[PDB]
Amino acid sequence: IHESSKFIDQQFLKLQEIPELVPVGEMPRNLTMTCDRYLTNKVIPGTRVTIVGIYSIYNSKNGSGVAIRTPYIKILGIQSDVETSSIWNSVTMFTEEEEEEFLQLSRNPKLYEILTNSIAPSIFGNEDIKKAIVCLLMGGSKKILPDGMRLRGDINVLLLGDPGTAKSQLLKFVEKVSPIAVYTSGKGSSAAGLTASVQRDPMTREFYLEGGAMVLADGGVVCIDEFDKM
């Protein structure tokens, strides 16, 4: 009697040994992993995790040995590195003792000259650059005009010169400080594109947005280098 019955969600995960440390001679091995109720959807593929679990045994309808079973883990709880990479998830719910001190920081007069002193511990000179980069991370006049023809608030900055002189380095620190920063290059990178790539899902053959820096970086700065090689 389905209309007087109660049901729950469970999920199948696969975990594999991190490819940074595996035998040179062969592929990594992996474990079928399962979880139930509120433990579902807590984790995103490609995050780094520790699982606490029951290493358990089941029978697989293979087609494996003369008499055998397959291992699996029932997750009974999970935790992670605090957030893997940059993910569109973010926190707006700052605490009362943060607004208190951000307001007090706003009431320093030197605040602009403090950030230009702050946004670069190492880099020497190049004030006329760092000053502009401070202006970048703040966005700008996002304007939803009534005809819909909005204008960008963000700003675009180009570094040009002979190598050295931090023209590549200055992006690396920006990828630390800025919310949802992404660091890529011309021609994209290994297994990543610069711009939105579409392809079929190998199973169920569904078109979907695979990825790209401009797609992940929704809501922040994109760092690009070798911009001639597009």
Partner: protein, 49 residues
């Protein structure tokens, strides 16, 4: 004809970037000591840290 881009790229650089900064200066004898002695103070003795 050539590999990669073409002079057309002269547009997207000047038209679509809100600032372009051109940053080369020429081997000034005191500058390459100033930056060097700062960069030494990076690698160890952590004085900048």
């Amino acid at each position: 004809k050539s590999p990669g881009d073409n002079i057309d790229f002269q547009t997207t650089i000047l038209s679509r970037f809100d600032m372009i900064f051109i940053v080369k200066d020429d081997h000034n004898e005191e500058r390459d000591i100033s930056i060097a002695n700062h960069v030494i103070n990076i690698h160890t003795g952590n004085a900048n840290a």
